[PDB]
């Protein structure tokens, strides 16, 4: 697939859209509906732990398949130490190795050594053969980047606002 | 309805900065996994957290650990509002200081032992007033965020200067101690916890709303099983997690005419005084043991008072009574009949999985060497109860200390932090299991 | 010391032709996974098998299932001899016939339904006289190898002509029916089978050698739990797997007899048991004979109880008899019967958990063709509270439903019967009716 | 990397003149006090295991794998043809079904023709060419059957059939190799 690479930076944000979102006291007030809903879950969890059912092969296979059909496309964001975000579309069956290749091909210096990680706590993505589905970088996930001591300068000049990047994602995900 | 309204649920992720939502809820709120969110409870104290997806919770749920709940001053079941928080600036500088009662007996470089590794490229979101927990050196230290720049929250980035000079600060009364017993302190009772929550959470948590749904509250509950299975622990956690006041009655102590029924009455009066409350009678059999024959024998004056106090508590009082005993048969049947201790839960001997969970709880604060195999330890502890396992871990820690010695009322943090507990230390503890130094409080 | 001397143990692998050794034992005998092996027991009947390794064998163990045990006339614990047999030539032709009491109710092409899929590129080693079992069309059919060419053993290869014309044959006296109950008929009771085997196996199987070890055998064992959890199943399986004689006494049935007649039938049971020793006497519903009663002034101990106690106390070790009793709760029974030397051992045969139910469902579907949509784990999850008898009934009902969806007589054609697939819908049907017909169909 | 050291044998090349193994005495089959003690001991520890219900630990699983791979660094495979010819070859446990198929292909008379590999009984086709011999339990010595959709009776390269050896000579070749030689 084509990644449709895009770069955004929080200093390019142009909107202060709708701030006085003052929230009423009763929003936080628990209703009879709320209490009943909690009890249901408790009853439900009591029954399950008493009956100790099997987690079935068919259920496990159904969840995998149901999630891979629900999210055929993956949007990833690699956040740089200078707060630049590189955004790219992927498929869930693609690997962490592919992500690294995406990053490398958009670096100012492609020979420079880097590591990708999620946080918190800091967890490096070492297994390059691990898929994005297995890595849980799916359906939309934020990844950080670090180096031992970066994005192509031409690409920084076409950087957009984060909120603009968001709408690109929403539109791609339908 | 309103998609930003969520219900606080227990967490699977132990990390301070992490909350979890169902994937459909994240889709709805257009949230990336690993993204920053802003949270508020009814007290309106806000928190900034990182959001992850969780496969087991329903759409309206937000899974958060106790550190986050305390910061938001919420409890399990409370409402929070969620809004995306993309606008989080990297801190120029921050100030954090330890809570005094967590750092007693410790001296030296707190920054290097606790703070530096905790924040190191973790990009943690933090808010002025936040209390957070760093584990290490057989200890759990609590820190408070005194100031941030910019205010009132920021990301702790590599470039953020972390200041931490100053005096350890006093705990506030509104600030719940994280040393208080919670659900996350209990292992191998996932079933029994659920059974107890189902019965008491709602009546204790929302008395007014509970009575409105018609169902009658449990009068008295009987927890049974051998000593040290966690009966006190469970009742304590339920009280703490529901906000309920907790009163412990020690059966044997009360039984050692006259002053006994004075204590019993006052205990009950103090409970409804501070309602909603749990009254916990440890070793009920000491007070009301099963009597043989005794046909024309008068009921004991103590047993009578107890029935009076128990029958004299209407749903209105907001009190639930819990009792520990080994076997329900050791109790007088007058207490075990409806309107009294009509409900019972077995807190029995944990299994292998159960034991592993307990061992994981009581090693939380220890640095363990790579060779430490807690599963092996679980396998070699058949028959052990929670208390045996806590003692075992304590013996293993002391064995590590013995091997290293240092003496005083004070230890250096870096010294204390270099203590690795090895498998050989557990083998020692294992060999000594048969069911000192002030700078160290062991579990 | 004697590497080729092995001790019979129970199979994990349920294929007829397969036996299992520990890898270090296979190293020692220089065997390949898949090699043919020649086996002999005490009666010195031979069998030929394929050998696999097993991670859970002790070095002296040979794991084998009931088909091979019967062919060898051995039982769990017995000695066998192992030798390599790479000589085995490929069969020109074989003659196999069904055993009569296994094919009642069926007609048609037994080759197409059972024999063809069984031998199909399986390269199975066989011996003249072997009895083997094939599952299919709601039924387990037993076949005997009447003759082979070459004789007496060969490999059934693709070119081997399989002849099966002729009348069904009579079961021989020492030839045990594989329909008889054994350990492989019990699910969800691993723990309890182990507890019971530890108590009774050696006393019943090797009485003289057992005495020489000096430890005292149990006299009475109390099996307890709700109806249909497999208490009779277990006692019967232990009797069969040990070779011990089995005498069943039904509690209410013996109490229905007139005063005097009860006591005599009780005595006859014990005499019969002592006579055919080693033996198991099984008292179903012990509480019907000796219930726990309330203390009434001047109450005389029931004649029948006195008689049972006399019989228990009178069974010396040298009688080689063990008494098993089934009750719902241990407290339902006269405490006199539970004192040392009587029923002083008790084993909880309770309600099965999800894993237990799965195992039980797999046992009771093993003769059925299940469609790919059949999910027995799901069925197990939906049967919390069901015991063994509930689950066996459920499987009969799902199968009866499949038959109703298709087809009446006392005879069915093998190919028709074999085309039956029980579906998940059939189970859902059986589930909706579950609340804990035709002659040619035998249901468990 | 691994010397396959390929050989072919046929059962029709065994000698058939030497004596049978000596018949066993009746005492061989007779159970002793010692046998009964060992059986009891096994029953006792199986009962315990089932009562305690220990965990099967990660460390245990990993050590079991590690020990097996160290104990058997070399694998002897035998592929059995419809005509009863056997091709024998040495492999590593970490090599694959695909490697096995390649090996078989290397020694076929018509390298183009289609074949499948299976284990029995029951017939179980080796369809996953990526599966390692360890995973497939073709280890440490295993016997595999060969089948072809159109059984045209050539299969093996006829030059190799000239040098076919006895089954028991093939066994010796395996024993020598497995003692690391
Ligand atoms: N299920 C458990 N999980 C973790 N720790 C436990 C558990 N049960 C017991 N313990 C440990 O043993 C100590 C004593 O337990 P306690 O609640 O007094 O048991 P009981 O009331 O049943 O005698 C607890 O403070 C705790 O450290
Ligand atoms: N544990 C089990 N495994 C397999 N089948 C069982 C089991 N328990 C019961 N059954 C089936 O149902 C019947 C149960 O009857 P029975 O053994 O008499 O139970 P109980 O003795 O407890 O009354 C058995 O004949 C068998 O077909
Ligand atoms: Mg106690
Ligand atoms: Mg019955």
Numbering used by the authors:
A (entry chain C): 318 to 466, 471 to 495
B (entry chain D): 21 to 276, 279 to 427, 432 to 461, 473 to 480
C (entry chain B): 21 to 427, 433 to 461, 473 to 480
D (entry chain A): 317 to 497
What does the paper say about this structure?
To examine the molecular details of the interaction between p97 and ASPL, we determined the crystal structure of an ADP-bound p97-ND1 fragment in complex with ASPL-C at 2.46 Å resolution using molecular replacement. Two molecules each of p97-ND1 and ASPL-C were present in the asymmetric unit of the crystal, forming a compact heterotetrameric p97-ND1:ASPL-C protein complex. Two heterodimeric p97-ND1:ASPL-C units were found to be interlocked with each other, forming a central cavity with a diameter of ∼17 Å. In each heterodimer, the N and D1 domains of p97-ND1 bind to ASPL-C primarily via polar interactions, burying an extensive interface area of 2,300 Å2. Two such heterodimeric units are assembled via a second interaction interface of 700 Å2 including many polar and van der Waals interactions. The overall structure of the p97-ND1 fragment in the heterotetramer shows high similarity to p97-ND1 in p47 bound hexamers (r.m.s.d.=0.95 Å). The conserved UBX-domain core (residues 390–466) in ASPL-C, which forms a β-grasp fold, is also similar to previously reported structures of UBX domains in other p97-binding proteins such as p47 (r.m.s.d.=1.7 Å), FAF1 (r.m.s.d.=1.6 Å) and Npl4 (r.m.s.d.=2.2 Å). However, we found that the N- and C-terminal regions of the UBX domain in ASPL-C contain unique structural extensions, which were not observed in previously reported UBX-domain-containing proteins. Strikingly, the α-helical lariat wraps around almost the entire Na subdomain of p97, suggesting that it is critical for the conversion of hexamers into heterotetramers. It shows that the α-helical lariat directly targets the D1:D1 interprotomer interface in p97 hexamers, a region critical for hexamer stability, suggesting that it might play an important role in the dissociation of p97 homohexamers.
